[PDB]
């Protein structure tokens, strides 16, 4: 049976655009019903890497389970959670993606972070995250203290280092910075490692699924 996304795009649904919350829960589906120009997608602008592939891999799913891979209340004792954005407003108030967590400095430091997850389930786990690129060096230091940060994401079948590039993009939804979104499928028995000293839009909810 088709997956009805209403006014949301796959990106808005899978990242957890706050306006995509009322979507009814589904454990299986075949074919995703998406409008030609969905109103609610990447509310904070950025590049969604490998997006068409992700759309194809999620077109038919037999089992789908969202779980809190990095629980908000216990995973980030050394960092704060940003106030989100007006670009991702819900009910006239600034908010952010439900499935991601915008980490910011705690006090005068953004401490180095290392967070890992072992796929204890017997299904593949879809993990999503982002990398923030501020428009100015003032916003970079205001949020993350250090001027030159890195993000590192490594599994047994994934390894990538991300470097924020500070510059004004054309304004999109009143935002000249960007958050680039990435994902990988974590096979059972594999471990994913997140390392960063700034600019990490951390996973909060991941998805254990069986494709096809």
């Amino acid at each position: 049976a088709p997956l009805q996304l209403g006014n949301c795009s796959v990106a808005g649904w899978i990242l957890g655009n706050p306006e995509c919350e009322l979507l009814i829960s589904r454990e299986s589906w075949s074919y995703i019903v998406e409008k030609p120009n969905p109103e609610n997608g990447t509310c904070y602008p950025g590049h969604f890497a490998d997006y068409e592939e992700l759309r194809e891999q999620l077109s038919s799913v037999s089992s789908f389970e969202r779980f809190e891979i990095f629980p908000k209340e216990s995973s980030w004792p050394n960092h704060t959670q940003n106030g989100g954005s007006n670009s991702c407003s819900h009910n006239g108030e600034s908010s952010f993606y439900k499935n991601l967590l915008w980490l910011t400095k705690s006090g005068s430091l953004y401490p180095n972070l290392s967070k890992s997850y072992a796929n204890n389930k017997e299904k593949e786990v879809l993990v999503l995250w982002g990398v923030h690129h501020p428009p100015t060096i003032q916003e970079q230091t205001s949020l993350y203290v250090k001027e030159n940060a890195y993000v590192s994401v490594v599994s047994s079948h994934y390894s990538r280092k991300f470097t924020p590039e500070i510059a004004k993009r054309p304004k999109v939804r009143d935002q000249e910075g960007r958050i680039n979104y990435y994902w990988t499928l974590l096979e059972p028995g594999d471990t994913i490692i997140f390392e960063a000293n700034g600019n990490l839009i951390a996973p909060r909810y991941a998805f254990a699924l069986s494709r096809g």
Partner: antibody, heavy 126, light 109 residues
Framework: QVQLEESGPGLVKPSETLSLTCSVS??????????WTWIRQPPGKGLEWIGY???????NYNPSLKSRVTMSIDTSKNEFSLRLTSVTAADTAVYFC??????????????????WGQGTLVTVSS | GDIVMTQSPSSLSASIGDRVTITCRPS??????LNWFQHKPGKAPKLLIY???NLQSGVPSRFSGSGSGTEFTLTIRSLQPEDFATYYC?????????FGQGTKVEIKR
């Protein structure tokens, strides 16, 4: 913030090579996120995109001009240039240099120049 | 230059305070990869609208962009004398980038 200034207007002899330079102030031409572009407007016609160049080595020139076009970046002067060989009167135009910011969610690579110079007029004449 | 960008009209005249709409139609679907430029005599062309509908910093809110696919609209509400210019759409979907032929907006007074 960023300022772009094309080289002075003037003449090129037919079949010779047009050389223009764009002076950049406010950012480095070596930055990985910025691309540098040339556009031209012949008299009484519209805009024609010529191409872009990244410092990292990525370039793309309009197939209508690809064989005649060479762009380069001068990090010592913080400038970038356009060379156009074998010019004819069809190449008489105002030439604009411009900067864009790589933004793959909303633009093809190197395809959205959002800070332009005011342009310089090149006349092909003997 | 394979994606042809066709603007309509090629020139128009309107009074101060009028609502002005300019249409741009690509020869194929370009999703939202569509920008609008303003070009005043002797001045650098200016990006007003980015990716079909995003107003750029410092541009008066009387300018707006809408559309997707094969139909796009630039709207100037409450036309002002300083809005005399030629307006171009530009597609960023395929290389090479291509511009519309331009729309000259004149002021009726």
């Amino acid at each position: 913030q960023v300022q772009l200034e094309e080289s002075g207007p003037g003449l090129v002899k037919p079949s010779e090579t047009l050389s223009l330079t764009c002076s950049v102030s406010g950012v480095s031409v070596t930055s990985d996120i910025y691309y540098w572009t040339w556009i031209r407007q012949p008299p009484g016609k519209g805009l024609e995109w010529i191409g872009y160049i990244f410092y990292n080595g990525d370039t793309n020139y309009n197939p209508s001009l690809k064989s005649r076009v060479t762009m380069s970046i001068d990090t010592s002067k913080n400038e970038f240039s356009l060379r156009l060989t074998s010019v004819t009167a069809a190449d008489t135009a105002v030439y604009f240099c411009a900067r864009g910011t790589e933004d793959l969610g909303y633009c093809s690579s190197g395809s959205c120049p959002n800070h332009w110079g005011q342009g310089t007029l090149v006349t092909v004449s003997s | 230059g394979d994606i042809v960008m066709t603007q309509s009209p090629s020139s128009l005249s309107a009074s101060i305070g009028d609502r002005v709409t300019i249409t741009c139609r690509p020869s194929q679907n370009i999703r939202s990869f569509l920008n609008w430029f303003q070009h005043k005599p002797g001045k650098a062309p200016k990006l007003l609208i980015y990716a079909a509908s995003n107003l750029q910093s410092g541009v008066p809110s009387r300018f707006s962009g809408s559309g997707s696919g094969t139909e796009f609209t630039l709207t100037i509400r409450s036309l002002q004398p300083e809005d005399f210019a030629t307006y171009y759409c530009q597609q960023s979907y395929n290389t090479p980038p291509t511009f519309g032929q331009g729309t000259k907006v004149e002021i009726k007074r």
